[model samples]
Target: TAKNTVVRGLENVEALEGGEALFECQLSQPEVAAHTWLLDDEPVRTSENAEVVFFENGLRHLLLLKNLRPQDSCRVTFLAGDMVTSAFLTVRGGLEHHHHHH
Candidate 1:
């Protein structure tokens, strides 16, 4: 039998400065055996300025981002065995100061 799973916290994330962004995710199913978060298709480990915290309920996790830059914008993937979910992140603070000379 296929397991039923669900992911949350994808539509309320706000775009902020490219440094130190906080994110949270939740998952639910029949029984969770493994859960992980991914960044740009890569398994999220230790970043010089990023960290993730997994909750005991196996349904919640927090992402802490630091030293963020424009290029840091990408998709964050959440995987719970076979069920996978993703969200897009973007930098939004440095674009207002640019001036076009043309």
Candidate 2:
């Protein structure tokens, strides 16, 4: 039988505002060439505030969030093929409320 593609699972992370949060995972399958990261069930793209980093030594992948904001707290999912891993990010010292004014 073949082993699962995911060798390591993502862990929950906590960071403060203005700081950075990094989430990483490992894959056992070398054939898996690409992966995707989802924030709050939405696919994340590399931008000024967010990026996808890779480790050459290991089949490790990382998601980096910079200039952390309250809205950055979200459920992050890593997916490749049928394998999937997830973690939650909590950013402290920020407003958790959103005011809607008419």
Candidate 3:
């Protein structure tokens, strides 16, 4: 039997400064053999700026970002099995003060 590996792609996320950002993806596998998360094509690890979590027995995955910054706006990708998906993260309101002028 052929297994159909489908990817439930991530949706674009927008978070305000000092707020939280979340990225999630779903896979069509009963058990994920392997999985990866990347930011701007670079691998990401759980740290002070970010955290990763898995749920639904590996069918769902999440990446959480705390104390967001404008630089946090970047491309993120999730890969599982042979399926891959990507989304963009945007941090807004950080430049609000810069646009204020007389």
Candidate 4:
């Protein structure tokens, strides 16, 4: 049987120019063994300039975005089998160079 679980976390991502931002999401239980991290519907991988860290203790996974750009503002989705979770990634860039300043 499958337990209907509610996906949690992945609220905000903050980073400066030439820096990195981390995004995370927690699964309710071990019912989630495998997951896919997607950036604007595209798969994210370590070899692609980012890191995906999975923690068993917290039942969570983290996506690290390195050297962010303005184009990083897009919908990030995590698909775990039948369940899917999403959050918007907003990286301050351009002339303003900061979210608060703009």
- The best candidate by TM-score is 3
Cα lDDT of model 1 by residue, 1-102, tens digit? 256466575433455665577777665654666666677656676775776766755556677777566666788776667667677787765664435441
Model 3, 37: alpha-carbon shift in Å? 1.4
lDDT of 3 by residue, 28-87 (tens): 777645666678655677686786877888667777778776766788877676777877
lDDT of each: 0.65, 0.74, 0.73, 0.68
Q: Alpha carbon lDDT of residue 85, candidate 4?
A: 76
Q: Which candidate has the highest lDDT of all? A: 2
Q: What tens digits encode model 2's per-residue C-alpha lDDT throughout 1-102?
A: 244467788898988888998887877765545556677755576696887767764477877778887776778877776788888789875555657431
Candidates, ranked, TM-score: 3, 2, 4, 1
Cα shift from native, residue 59, model 3 (Å): 0.8
Q: How accurate locally is residue 56 in candidate 4, as Cα lDDT from 0 to 100?
A: 86
Superposing all C-alpha atoms, what RMSD in Å does each candidate have to the true structure? 5.6, 3.8, 5.2, 5.7
Q: Candidate 3: which stretches are off by over 4 Å?
A: 1-4, 93-102
For model 4, the stretches where C-alpha displacement exceeds 4 angstroms are 1-4, 31-34, 46-48, 95-102
> TM-score for all predictions?
0.65, 0.76, 0.77, 0.70
Please give the distance, in angstroms, between residue 91's alpha carbon in candidate 3 and its true position after superposition: 0.6
Residue runs of model 2 more than 4 Å from their true location after superposition: 1-4, 95-102
Higher-TM-score candidate among 1 and 4?
A: 4
Stretches of candidate 1 exceeding 4 Å from the true structure: 1-4, 7-9, 29-32, 93-102
